[PDB]
Amino acid sequence: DASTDLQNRLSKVNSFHASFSQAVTSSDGAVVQEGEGELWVKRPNLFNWHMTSPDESVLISDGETLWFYNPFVEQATATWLKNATGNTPFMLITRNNPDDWKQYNVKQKGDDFELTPKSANLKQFAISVTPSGTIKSFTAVEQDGQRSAYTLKSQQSSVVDASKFTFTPPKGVTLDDQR
Amino acid sequence: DASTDLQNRLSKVNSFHASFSQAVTSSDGAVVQEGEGELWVKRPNLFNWHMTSPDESVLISDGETLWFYNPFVEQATATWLKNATGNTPFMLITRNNPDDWKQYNVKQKGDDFELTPKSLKQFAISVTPSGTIKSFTAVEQDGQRSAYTLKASKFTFTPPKGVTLDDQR
Amino acid sequence: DASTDLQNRLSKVNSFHASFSQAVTSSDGAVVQEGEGELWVKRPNLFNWHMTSPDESVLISDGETLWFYNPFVEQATATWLKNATGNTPFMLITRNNPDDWKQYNVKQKGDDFELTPKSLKQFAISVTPSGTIKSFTAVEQDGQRSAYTLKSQQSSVVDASKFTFTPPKGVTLDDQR
Q: What domains lie within chain C, and their CATH numbers?
């Protein structure tokens, strides 16, 4: 019931945009880092995730290649998307693949879902999503108790020009091409 | 006996306040973060731990409920204190529970105590003979180190409006 | 093959200095921290690693003792270097010890080497044929990545004073020696 319901809710909106706030907190309650950004998702296999502060970070899927880019160390990494897995709440959300969801035991409390893996450094993921499909927040907890929490705002369902899901490494950027 | 000595020292001061500095350093020596805050402890079961810089976070036990709060993402988590464990040096210190201490092999060097789990890598706590806590450190298996140095309505919490509470109770 | 080539390149420059930028990135692409500093190495067994931003941090080997120092919390830690291990890409580089390298399966693609432990997820090191180290990265099992990029590497021999450390006044020393 819980897993099927979560999947049904995520299936309702396949092209959306939203801003986010992030807080990484150790088990003792100390903040490791806080940041902000925005994200765009177009199922299937397309996304643009951009952390804008306090440091910039770029993660984009053009449908074939998954790109990671850090402007500060002037490095990018390229991999084939087909090799990627649902290893972060955001990746699970972009894929919404039944084969991924079956690897977790899912519990539901209203709009709040908790996912605990069936085998083994994660402890559990949490995703809050309304009945109509609005993603409100998501969290990843590690075995050491560290928590990575995201809250989403201004969530709008729209289809943006495909140009958002493309990336070419900027001039002067060293590409670690694992493809 | 090092465990007994540590417990004896901790049991000397059951109600206290201190300000703290914190530094989180990875095994390669890179600083992950540095911060400051203050804390109040009143055994049994009450505390207020507050990081004030550079990012605010609150951890409070009202004696029944353990609350975590992060104003930046406006989230709070409530759990029953009965279910908490001494999984951080601060928690071990607030509880000072023999049942927690017996889960560690404790070595002593003057005021410096090192604790290794029988079943993280290790915790360290420095406390004077009179029970003044000077510092405590937690080390993970990957070598990351979290080091702290130390220098009634307080034990209550009411989630502010617009805060989303994950009530695990 | 690859491990022998990596070692051969590292053996060409035993005394050098470099400036570095660092970026710690979680598996979701979120930057945990960014920083910069400089480092000096003189094999065997001597080094001075200094982070200037976001906050000061100092890691020095005077050839016998390994020192960690954080001025903000006013703490230092001393241990015997003989007990140190090649537990980070930086330490592996300072040691360039065949006995360390053997604990890893090494793959090569031009100047890019990738090391996977036989018994941490992976380490990666880039070094030119002439011995110029360009970058190194560590990846944990949780997918968090610590990436260092090296700039202005100079093969030089600085004064021996760079490889010494005395705890400043008022710093508490955790002497594990």
A: 1-177 (2.50.20.10)
- Give the end-to-end CA distance of chain C in Å, rounded to a whole number: 39
Whether B74 and chain A come into contact, CB under 8 Å, resolves to yes
Contacts of B149 in chain C (CB under 8 A): 73-75, 172
- The CA-based diameter of chain B, rounded to the nearest angstrom, is 50
Question: Which residues make beta-bridge pairs with B165?
Answer: B76
CA distance C64 to C79: 9
Q: Tokens 């950004």 appear where?
A: A37
Neighbours of A44 (CB within 10 A): 11
Q: Which of C25, C52, C57, C69 to mutate to test the interface with B (most CBs of B within 10 A)?
A: C57
Shortest distance, CA C148 to any CA of chain A (angstroms) = 7
- Chain C within 8 Å of A100 (Cβ-Cβ)? no
Encoded tokens for C35: 């920083």
Nearest-angstrom CA–CA distance, A14 and A37: 20
**C89/chain B closest Cα distance in angstroms:** 8
Residues in Cβ contact with C135 at an 8 Å cutoff, skipping those fewer than 6 apart: A73, A75, A174, C124, C125, C126, C147, C148, C149, C150
Q: Which residue of B70, B88, B91 is in closest CB contact with A25? A: B70
| Experiment type | X-ray
Of B72, B18, B7, B76, which Cα lies nearest the Cα of B42?
B18
**Edge-to-edge strand order for the sheet containing B75-80?**
B104-109, B112-117, B122-127, B133-139, B145-150, B15-25, B31-42, B46-53, B57-62, B65-70, B75-80, B164-167
Residues of C in contact with A59 (CB under 8 A): 28-29
Burial of B54: CB neighbours in 10 Å, binned 0-12, 13-18, 19+: middle
Whether C57 sits inside 8 A of B21 (CB atoms) is no
DSSP symbols for chain A:
-HHHHHHHHHHT-SEEEEEEEEEEE-TTS-EEEEEEEEEEEETTTEEEEEEEESS-EEEEEESSEEEEEETTTTEEEEEEGGG--S-SHHHHHHH--HHHHTTEEEEEETTEEEEEES---EEEEEEEE-TT--EEEEEEEETT--EEEEEEEEEE-----GGGG---PPTTPEEEE--
Among candidates B51, B146, B164 on the partner chain, residue whose Cβ is nearest the Cβ of A31: B51
Hey, what are B109's tokens? 């060097």
Contacts of A176 in chain C (CB under 8 A): 112, 124
Does B57 lie at the interface with C, CB-CB under 8 angstroms?
no
For chains A and B, CB pairs below 8 A equal: 70
- Comparing CB atoms, the residue among C59, C73, C138 nearest residue B21 is C73
CA angle A131, A34, A136 (to 5 degrees): 5
At B148, which amino acid appears?
A: Y
